[PDB]
Design a protein around this ligand. Structure first.
Ligand SMILES: CC(C)CCC[C@@H](C)[C@H]1CC[C@H]2[C@@H]3CC=C4C[C@@H](O)CC[C@]4(C)[C@H]3CC[C@]12C
Ligand SMILES: *[C@@H]1O[C@H](CO)[C@@H](O)[C@H](O)[C@H]1NC(C)=O
Ligand SMILES: *[C@@H]1O[C@H](CO)[C@@H](O)[C@H](O)[C@H]1NC(C)=O
Ligand SMILES: [K+]
Ligand SMILES: [K+]
Ligand SMILES: [K+]
Ligand SMILES: [Mg+2]
Lengths: 987, 271
């Protein structure tokens, strides 16, 4: 079922399977029957839901389904009192359009968090060829790709990309680029032979969008459109369950807590309201006023704004997000699955070791040449360097003198590419040293030869000799060598040297690297004059008994900042997994090189050999590490996969289908994981989508990855991931300090209306001045905590448990609401009663006064000095309790923001003004509060009165209180982490 | 979604923790309640009994008229001079209003014949308070229920009662006793000015009624009244009559406060 099995079948079983011919192609008719059976050969573009219906849910939710009903209580309270002629209650038209403005701006504060939103299947139609070259009715012509059908007989040639999933029948020196399948850009030969059980390995299958590099081929289309291998890759990319992000679930958690809490409070006092005697057309205008008081309107704002002041900080260190939800995901991530090629690596074949002086010297594999150089004073070495430099046909292009040797562009294959660059580093110039020794002859690397060979005259005028240089497949370089350089001498090749060489070329062969022999020989002037008639195809020169000069080996080396980055993340408790398509034995070596595997860790295939015991006998548990190939995984249950992921802590997967990357990534997510994925290639996209954060490499990234990723490291500096963890743990711990500041004030916003409903005292805090506390004065101070530095060394902490530790947990809410908010309500009501008592109305008088207070028809209400008070003289003072409770709150939202600086330290033992942005928010909190208070026009427009200076002082012991109540608590958990003071009153 | 059962085993923790936390939280809660009450007890220990600290919403007093039959957006007094059971709901609301103004409900006050600020600084009256000055029914003379216990209402020239809003220590001035003067707001181009006649003479309020020293210092003190005998208002027309108080320390130019020194009332005298 869709399993490409056509590589196994014969030529005869094929014209039966597609009713076709082997040299004629299909019949012109049948090429349409299949097209009108299977549709065209292209990629079905999956539209998401439209661009405006993702504005439609952004206006719904737990805080958004309430602020629709309170603007529907405000336009059914500007509607039952405007048909009756009551122009005075445009306090509910001013209160309907400002709440729907809180619906849509907060709706714009959740939609403008999608920067790109680019279609992923945008970049799957750009790796594809426009036209093919087919045969039908035995005539060769040129056709559109989207006209190829299952059974079409196509011709490939190098330079064009492959136009279908095509089983090859004949092919002449044909090679492809299967990075898009393996992530590996090393040519893969193809042939009519069925060289594997899997069609992903065998050579008689060529895949849609694979760039055919060199040669020709003819074969039959076997899969089409989305049925091709690269098409299956696209179906998993777009077609991923868009699970909410970590913070999204946490956002929706406390929304559901507050959405439940706002519906208890207001709707047990609607039962109270009708049952202590208000009518229904009053009792419905208490829920509305309670919910505006309890719900923090501009909370959702302060959240997303905070996320931006991280994202910018991320961008400035060249890490750009694509939606704000990602900016935190790293700090909550437990597991990182990474591609190897051009993710941790440089995807650039480069030199690593060179066997000479019967000992393996370690070369310097870094993109900036930082690390450990090797032994270059050996006279036996400076010959080995003379052979590889000369015997090299690659070349730098003109005009790259300001380019780093690694990042230069070289003509030829990656082998000579590596050596040439290495030659440009140890030597000053690799090209000039090849011209002082001009070349007279050559044989390039052939395959009947299975080596390379060239012969040159010398730079020395006094030396007239001829020097032969050669390189080839290490074993074959030995059996045409009879002498050897050890430390400066030359020695015969006994059976003790033909054993110490077959040691090293198999030693580094366990590090999984390309190995190359090297050898030389100086042709004497007595049988080869300094102008001698060298004739190549005649083959008069000896081509044996040459002086071996030393192996060299090369590998796909890691990036400069990767092995330190990896160590930092496991030091943050994070488990790291290699997930690659590369061959197993390069992978394992790379994993220990970057530090996915730690010094001393063993496979079951490392143990069994040190004990000399077969592998089935090994106890699995013993192994610190394990390695699993593409076949093995497919042979596994997932039941066996978890037992494995459990059993061995350091894991390496390799030769993996892009299909299988995802499996692993979600097979972790099922165990409750927050999963990051870093990647660069077309193989990587589906596990970049499904990952709770996907990261792609900015430069070396293939587009399909980049358009699937949520984060983009522009500079590929992988150690950026560590900075994003730091700022995702920081933002996580810096969001719950801001929320508590925003949430504690919701209690002194609420308690007035409750009292005002029951005790029938005047309204202490009006819905207008509440909306200014929430939507202005305490916006800046709420956000300024996004600039707190950690209290514990955050990178030594394990990553949080994503079930247990939450953003708004039950203890934080209760402490801000019930305790801090109580003191904030007990300053606010201490100020409400001094302003009432110093201006005419004593305490008991307030009880039951509201009905006489809120009366247009009574312009004479005699107070507690008998003084008669007009309705405007009374409502002017109702504004002087709007504006005196309001400032009792603002005085407690300074001591708040200073005890929302620290969760474990004292503000004493770190400091008070260490955050400089915080102390700039406080002076704005204060000075928008005086602007509203004192500015002319404020009493009538915004309902704000120029209060007396003693009414700022009344809530000041209450603020000095709030600070030191939290102070004693912060020390209290320090000196005793165990006892009841820690386990119940911490947040 | 399946089935969503409750969380009865959600005693979030154990019944010893909940007695532990609860008696903590209320130990917090009541401590504050006694600190908050300690404050309002210190608050009601700084206050002064006869004089308010600040009158921040009492610069110019309000002014209020009787009979008070309201409609939407203002005072409206639209009756029937002939028909007698639609001015008996305005004639009785002026009477029962004055049922605390008679010489017997004025048994507490003393006659002031000073006609200047009634300045008192120590307490001589029955039960240690300051003295007041009478205001009686008959002083509105023809608009007091005698000789007119329908208050000019049958004769198309009724008698409203303009009532000031007394204020503690409030000095309106002492060069003159401040008067009433009720006239149209829109002077009609074909009609005449609202010719009107006040009780007692000039429509003033005597200077011996002030200063007010609280409802504790002059307990039985009564506001002085006036009664404008409105003559002109033509029959079957809707006019607007503004009843101001002109004075030294009084204004009537507050566009947010329509009952501050002036009281605007629609009036219709049908036939
Ligand atoms: C002061 C008087 C009048 C009210 C007392 C009501 C009691 C039953 C209320 C008031 C405060 C409430 C507590 C406030 C905070 C928390 C912490 C939270 O993690 C669980 C619920 C819990 C523990 C609440 C339980 C019920 C509670 C104790
Ligand atoms: C106080 O004096 C008044 C005199 O007006 C008297 O009527 C009243 O009964 C007295 N009350 C007390 C408690 O002495
Ligand atoms: C008015 O009052 C002042 C009090 O400051 C007083 O000195 C003055 O004599 C009075 N003048 C008149 C005309 O009553
Ligand atoms: K609010
Ligand atoms: K690539
Ligand atoms: K994702
Ligand atoms: Mg790659």
């Amino acid at each position: 079922g869709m399993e490409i099995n056509d590589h196994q079948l014969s030529v005869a079983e094929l014209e039966q399977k597609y009713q076709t011919s082997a040299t004629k192609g299909l019949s012109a008719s049948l090429a349409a029957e299949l097209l009108l059976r299977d549709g065209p050969n292209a990629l079905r573009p999956p539209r998401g839901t439209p661009e405006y219906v993702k504005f439609a849910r952004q206006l719904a939710g737990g805080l958004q389904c309430l602020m629709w009903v309170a603007a529907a209580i405000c336009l059914i309270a500007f509607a039952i009192q405007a048909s009756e002629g009551d122009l005075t209650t445009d306090d509910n038209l001013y209160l309907a359009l400002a709440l729907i403005a809180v619906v849509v701006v907060t709706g714009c504060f959740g939609y403008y968090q999608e920067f790109k939103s680019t279609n992923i299947i945008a970049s799957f139609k750009n790796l594809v060829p426009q036209q093919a070259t087919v045969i039908r009715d035995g005539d060769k012509f040129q056709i559109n790709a989207d006209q190829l059908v299952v059974g079409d007989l196509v011709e490939m040639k190098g330079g064009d990309r492959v136009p279908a999933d095509i089983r090859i029948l004949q092919a002449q020196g044909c090679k492809v680029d299967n990075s898009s399948l393996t992530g590996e850009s090393e040519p893969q030969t193809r042939s009519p032979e069925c060289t594997h059980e899997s069609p992903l390995e065998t050579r008689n299958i060529a895949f849609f969008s694979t760039m055919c590099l060199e040669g020709t081929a003819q074969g039959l289309v076997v899969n089409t459109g989305d049925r091709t291998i690269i098409g299956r890759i696209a179906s998993l990319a777009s077609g991923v369950e868009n699970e909410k992000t970590p913070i999204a679930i946490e956002i929706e958690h406390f929304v559901d807590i507050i959405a439940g809490l706002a519906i208890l409070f207001g709707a047990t006092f609607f039962i109270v309201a009708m049952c202590i005697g208000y009518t229904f057309l009053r009792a419905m205008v208490f829920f509305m006023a309670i919910v505006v008081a309890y719900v923090p309107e501009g909370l959702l704002a302060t959240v997303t704004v905070c996320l931006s002041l991280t994202a910018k900080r991320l961008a400035s260190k060249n890490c750009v997000v694509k939606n704000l939800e990602a900016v935190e995901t790293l700090g909550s991530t437990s597991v990182i699955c990474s591609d190897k090629t051009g993710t941790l690596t440089q995807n650039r074949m480069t030199v690593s070791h060179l066997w000479f002086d019967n000992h393996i010297h370690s070369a310097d594999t870094t993109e900036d040449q930082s690390g450990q150089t090797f032994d270059q004073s050996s006279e036996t070495w400076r010959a080995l360097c003379r052979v590889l430099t000369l015997c090299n046909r690659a070349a730098f292009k003109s005009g790259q003198d300001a380019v780093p040797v690694p990042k230069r562009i070289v003509i030829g294959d990656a082998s000579e590419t590596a050596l040439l660059k290495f030659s440009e580093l140890t030597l000053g110039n690799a090209m000039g040293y090849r011209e002082r020794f001009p070349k007279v002859c050559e044989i390039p690397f052939n395959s009947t030869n299975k080596f390379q060979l060239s012969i040159h005259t010398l730079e020395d005028p006094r030396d007239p000799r001829h020097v032969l240089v050669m390189k080839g497949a290490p074993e074959r370089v030995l059996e045409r060598c009879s002498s050897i350089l050890i430390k400066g001498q030359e020695l015969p090749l006994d059976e003790q040297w033909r054993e110490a060489f077959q040691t090293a070329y198999l030693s580094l062969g366990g590090l999984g690297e390309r190995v190359l022999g090297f050898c030389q020989l100086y042709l004497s002037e007595k049988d080869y004059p300094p102008g001698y008639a060298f004739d190549v195809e005649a083959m008069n020169f000896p081509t044996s008994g040459l002086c071996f000069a030393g192996l060299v080996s090369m590998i796909d080396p890691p990036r400069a900042t990767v092995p330190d980055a990896v160590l930092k993340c496991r030091t943050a408790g994070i488990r790291v997994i290699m997930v690659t398509g590369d061959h197993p034995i390069t992978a394992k070596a790379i994993a220990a090189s970057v530090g996915i595997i730690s010094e001393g860790s063993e496979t079951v295939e490392d143990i069994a050999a040190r004990l000399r015991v077969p592998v089935d006998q090994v106890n699995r548990k013993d192994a610190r590490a394990c390695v699993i190939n593409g076949m093995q995984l497919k042979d596994m249950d997932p039941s066996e996969l978890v037992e494995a992921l459990r059993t061995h802590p350091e894991m390496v997967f390799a030769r993996t289908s892009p299909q299988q990357k995802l499996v692993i990534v979600e097979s972790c997510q099922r165990l409750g994981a927050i999963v990051a994925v870093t990647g660069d290639g077309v193989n990587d996209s589906p596990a970049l989508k499904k990952a709770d954060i996907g990261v792609a490499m900015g430069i070396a990234g293939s587009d399909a990855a980049k358009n699937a990723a949520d984060m983009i490291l522009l500079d590929d500096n992988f150690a950026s991931i560590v900075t994003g963890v730091e700022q995702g743990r920081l933002i996580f711990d810096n969001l719950k300090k801001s929320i508590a500041y925003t949430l504690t004030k919701n209690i002194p916003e609420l308690t007035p209306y409750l009292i005002y409903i029951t005790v029938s005292v005047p309204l202490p805090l009006g819905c207008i001045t509440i909306l200014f506390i929430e939507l202005c004065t305490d916006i800046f101070p709420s956000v300024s905590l996004a600039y707190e530095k950690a209290e514990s060394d955050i990178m030594h902490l394990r990553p949080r448990n994503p079930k247990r530790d939450r953003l708004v947990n039950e203890p934080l809410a209760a402490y801000s609401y019930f305790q801090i908010g109580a003191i904030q309500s007990f300053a606010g009501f201490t100020d409400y009663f001094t302003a009432m008592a110093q201006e005419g109305w004593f305490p008991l008088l307030c009880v039951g006064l509201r009905p006489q207070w809120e009366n247009h028809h009574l312009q004479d209400l005699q107070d507690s000095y008998g003084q008669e008070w007009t309705f405007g003289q009374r409502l002017y003072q109702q504004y002087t309790c709007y504006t005196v409770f309001f400032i009792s709150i603002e005085m407690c939202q300074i001591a708040d923001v200073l005890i929302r600086k620290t969760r474990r330290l004292s503000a004493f033992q770190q400091g008070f003004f260490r955050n400089r942005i915080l102390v700039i928010a406080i002076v704005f909190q204060v000075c928008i509060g005086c602007f509203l208070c004192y500015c002319p026009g404020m009493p009538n427009i915004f309902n704000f009165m120029p209060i007396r200076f003693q009414w700022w002082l009344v809530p000041m012991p209450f603020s000095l209180l709030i600070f030191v109540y939290d102070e004693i608590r912060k020390l209290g958990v320090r000196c005793c982490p165990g006892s009841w003071w820690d386990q119940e009153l911490y947040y | 979604y399946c089935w969503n059962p409750d969380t009865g085993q959600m005693l979030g923790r154990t019944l010893s923790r909940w007695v532990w936390i609860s008696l903590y939280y209320v130990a917090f809660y009541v401590v504050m309640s006694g600190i908050f009450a300690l404050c309002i007890y210190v608050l009601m220990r700084t206050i002064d009994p006869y004089t308010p600290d600040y009158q921040d919403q009492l610069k110019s007093p309000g002014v209020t008229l009787r009979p008070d039959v309201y409609g939407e957006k203002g005072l409206d007094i639209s009756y029937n001079v002939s028909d007698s059971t639609t001015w008996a709901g305005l004639a009785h609301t002026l009477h029962r209003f004055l049922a605390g103004y008679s010489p017997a409900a004025q048994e507490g006050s003393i006659n002031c014949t000073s006609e200047k600020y009634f300045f008192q600084e120590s307490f001589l009256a029955p039960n240690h308070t300051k003295f007041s000055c009478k205001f009686t029914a008959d002083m509105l003379q023809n608009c007091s229920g005698r000789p007119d216990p329908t208050f000019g209402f049958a004769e198309g020239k009724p008698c409203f009662i303009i009532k000031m809003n007394r204020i503690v220590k409030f000095l309106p001035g002492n060069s003159t006793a401040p008067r009433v003067d009720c006239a149209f707001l829109d002077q009609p181009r074909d009609g005449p000015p609202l010719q009107v006649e006040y009780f007692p003479a000039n429509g003033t309020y005597s200077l011996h009624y002030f200063p007010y020293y609280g409802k504790k210092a002059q307990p039985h003190y009564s506001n002085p009244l006036v009664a404008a005998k409105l003559l002109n208002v033509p029959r079957n027309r809707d006019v607007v009559i503004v009843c101001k108080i002109l004075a030294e320390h009084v204004s009537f130019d507050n566009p947010h406060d329509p009952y501050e020194g002036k009281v605007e009332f629609k009036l219709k005298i049908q036939k």
